[PDB]
């Protein structure tokens, strides 16, 4: 009788809904913005935070925070706020008569889980909770029970491989270069056409012309050669004042930081040496199905080209004798969230809920011990 | 044989010399003053135009403009004049023989720097020159390879870490706030008792005013607190026609903008909050002589009480076991120069110069291969 | 060797030898040129040598 809450909380975006359905209806991003201004006009409801979708309406007045720094909650009262706003706002729903599925990236620490699951039965008294890992909430969704994920959102890139359900933890891999290193790279190299972007609203700005005009490359040093040739790869973008840009070559300088993150001085490896290394680690037999299985998931795998790329640099990296398919649905953006719909909603899940009596008789330490 | 020629352009003011020398010849003001009224006078030998000192004294008459803005050179022709004058007038030396050396702040945009390669190639007609980042040449006047450079001017206010020789790009920070923030903000606030400064011509007298009487407080509230419950803080200053004003807390209101950026507006940190990011964003075992070495320079950091301000904000956000000195030499306001000067003269640096011939095959695009 | 160490924040490190194996040869003859000139400061013409392997 009772419908499962999904509430898959990423770093920059948040999607909510009932279990069941095929599409979240609540998504909205995950901000709490404050006046920075002298307020003078007495009345007309000055509210002192705006947390979400208006907070992006409003944001040339307001100061924006983000709660979730790399899949870390910082600020608590925030992320109870932005909680408030999609159980009472946006879902219009009582808390208190439905189970809650969350998500997180793993190699999380422990405080994060304990946290959560302290606010979430003492605050809003749900009935029962759950935590999952977000990469077998996308392997879930792609409808198949071997293969190897990597998710990117917008703040964590992370990469599980599974084989029969059976994960394997000591080769899962954690790297924090997301959308928003991508972002603030942006914000870095379009100095050098003279366009200056340095607040937190404009941020948004140089984000939304990340997802608009930004691509992925197929060889970078021929992409190079041919925007130096030519003008052919430049495109314009309208700025909210009126004002017009124009960029060249930084639509593809900026998604190769997730090939080559020391164009930002980190001297780990790309996503591709990263999927590459966390199939050698895998066992020697498990390599065959890994890699006609390499799921793609979240956010930042949303840029035009980046599937041929991984392809070439997978297949370069990988004996010549095997298959490289590399899975991308264009629903990708959602997979945590309709994974997660699947997973509340089947009849064998639903003794391995946490209760609110197993919590009052372990503590938060339940959710160590039952989930993961 | 020949000398270089070492040509500090910054945004308020022209220091030009010879390399070698501890100290430049020809200080003077990058301004370009023009006529804004009508010539009755026949003869007198009036002129279109005049530049430096020659425009500060006849500027009760003349609108003056600055070519340089935050850095980016605005008016070319005005810096192309500014350019001509301390060559053929100040300096008394013809430019076709003699290699120069220009300095110039750093996440500039591009289209400025092979402009200014240009028209030094083809007006000019210099046989070599470079292109050089401040706070590298901070650090070779400092006469030490390690530490982290604030370097505030007129226009650009800017922290450069290097470690050992080695810059780390992704952590220079740039801000948007030096001295004509600071006089405007003084403008704005001098109001309060009544004396109005609206032309460009007074903000010369503005600016004067806060070279004399400004001070960084150390502690903000109780210098306010005293300022209210008493009168020794005020000071006198007399203007050139001879009226006499007195000024009180806006003494160290306006260099208060330097640490509280918030009174003009803006969103950003303040400098201590800006070297502390820019210290946190590099690597965790070379922080140990960032905090032991910061080093500042520019003119904006000539106020009294500076250095242990940001010694007490550092101290505060630093751990308590990290020992924090700030290198706060007598002659700062000059070492861009200094630096510049020990650069051009040292011995293996004269295979760096960007010749006559390789722009000659290269283009004007030869100086972001070869500069920095 | 130890001023690799003095200097590890503006480097990255590598091991040669990883599990026993040798991997990076001229590394390894670089380690060997490092100890036996400027460490125990001799020429090897004139001294045999003992090395150790798993
Ligand atoms: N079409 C797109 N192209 C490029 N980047 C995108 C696109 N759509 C979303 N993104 C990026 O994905 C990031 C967040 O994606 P997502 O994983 O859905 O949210 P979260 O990280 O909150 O889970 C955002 O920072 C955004 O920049
Ligand atoms: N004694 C002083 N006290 C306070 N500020 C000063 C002093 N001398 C110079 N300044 C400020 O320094 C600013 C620029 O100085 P400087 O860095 O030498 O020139 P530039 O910015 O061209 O490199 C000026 O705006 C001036 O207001
Ligand atoms: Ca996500
Ligand atoms: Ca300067």
Known sequence: ETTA????????????????????RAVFPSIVGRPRHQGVMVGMGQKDSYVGDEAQSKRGILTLKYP??????????????????????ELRVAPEEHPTLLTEAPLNPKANREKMTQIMFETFNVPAMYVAIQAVLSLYASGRTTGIVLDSGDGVTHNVPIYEGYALPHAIMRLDLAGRDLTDYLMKILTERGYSFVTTAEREIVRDIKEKLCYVALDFENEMATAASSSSLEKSYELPDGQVITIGNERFRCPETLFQPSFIGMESAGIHETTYNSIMKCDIDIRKDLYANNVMSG????????????????????????????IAPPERKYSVWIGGSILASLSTFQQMWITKQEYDEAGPSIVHRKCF
Chains 1, 2 share one sequence.
């Open 299 to 326: 956010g930042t795998t949303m840029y035009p080209g980046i599937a041929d790329r991984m392809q070439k640099e997978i297949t370069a990296l990988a004996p010549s004798t095997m298959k490289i398919k590399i």
């Open 68 to 89: 979730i720094e790399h899949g870390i909650i910082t600020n608590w009262d925030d992320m109870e706020k932005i909680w408030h706003h999609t159980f009472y706002n």
């Open 5 to 24: 809450l999904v509430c898959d909380n990423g770093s920059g975006l948040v999607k909510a809904g009932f279990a069941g359905d095929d599409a979240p």
